[PDB]
């Protein structure tokens, strides 16, 4: 599955929310990935994600290729807005 969100966070994707997200994307067996400006990184990984520097006012896509790639995006969409991180 997949979906495109627009970072609304005043500070982009960083701090606690980034962790909260990465930690969620790592609960499922699905291989979640973050596609931004072309480069992609494992969402279950901190170094990679935070290395991107997702500042505010941008767009991304959340992958999902496993036996729950749907239960993933739903929960991922959850925090994605629960932590005020776009929609």
């Amino acid at each position: 599955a997949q979906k495109t969100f627009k970072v609304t966070a005043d500070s982009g994707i960083h701090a606690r929310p980034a962790t909260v997200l990465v930690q969620t994307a790592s609960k499922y067996d699905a291989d979640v990935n973050l596609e931004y400006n072309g480069k992609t990184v494992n969402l279950k990984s901190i170094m990679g994600v935070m290395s991107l520097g997702i500042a505010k006012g941008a767009e991304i896509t959340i992958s999902a290729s496993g036996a729950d790639e749907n239960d993933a995006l739903n929960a991922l969409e959850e925090t994605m807005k629960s932590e005020g991180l776009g929609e």
């Binding site: 960083h14 606690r16 962790t19 930690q23 901190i46 170094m47 935070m50 520097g53």
Partner: protein, 332 residues
Amino acid sequence: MNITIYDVAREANVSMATVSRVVNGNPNVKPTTRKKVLEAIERLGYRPNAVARGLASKKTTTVGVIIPDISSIFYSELARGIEDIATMYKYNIILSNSDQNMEKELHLLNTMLGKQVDGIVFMGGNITDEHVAEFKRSPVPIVLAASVEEQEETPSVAIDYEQAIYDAVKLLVDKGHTDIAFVSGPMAEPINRSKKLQGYKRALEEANLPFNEQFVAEGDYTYDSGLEALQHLMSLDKKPTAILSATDEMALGIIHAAQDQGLSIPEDLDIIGFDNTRLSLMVRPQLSTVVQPTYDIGAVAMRLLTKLMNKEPVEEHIVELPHRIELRKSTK
């Protein structure tokens, strides 16, 4: 006289070897035997001993953190990053303040190693050879955060303070500022001298502007030193039309020192801090400042360590998280 892994063993007709295998979730166990001991645990109320385990396993699921002063708004954040990523990986933390004292830092490094930590995250304004010398002597990995190591040997995780300062100076000249000043920190520290100063001095000739020694104020990240900076700046005739501060806590000191002298901001001057700490947001006008992903620098650092500690190889050991600038109301 707690209950040991022995009590449990008997309470299930199984060797301590199995009780150990179950508690550590080891594959080679029969679901009958397992669910047999597991409840055998809760019945006795067994709680493992991390020390005992630590002696026999050569591992303590604990990391050591050496920070200069946890009361700083800056380090306290960085620390928050570390602590969080650490528990995301079932690791624990041992904190101690160094206050930038070489003897204390090294004594800590020793004390930490003594307690048998699985890894170490180090922070300090002046990493000397005598330091690197002692680093290479540790059985466990050591990661650096928001620090500057000339020798380039230990794996760090910061940003390019050199360029970061350039970016700032540039965006200023591009606004029409001839005479610009810099409020640095103790030059006794590399990070200030061999990085923040240079990125500033190169942005000058690269803009064809002459270097003015009287436009470089040395503080100590102290709000107070901040005020004493702007003051000493408006003293002399050639007074800058914009100032750059090494830290935000100092920037506020410059803003206020100005308003207390009459001049308005940004009405009369332009100031930019460096850190993007919640501080730069609790002032009027809301200070503009170079953004440094403090939390991230901590989280990444601790994360990078979890790899090195797990032996898993990693592409490059020196990371440079991306920085940027956020303009607010302390500029035109």
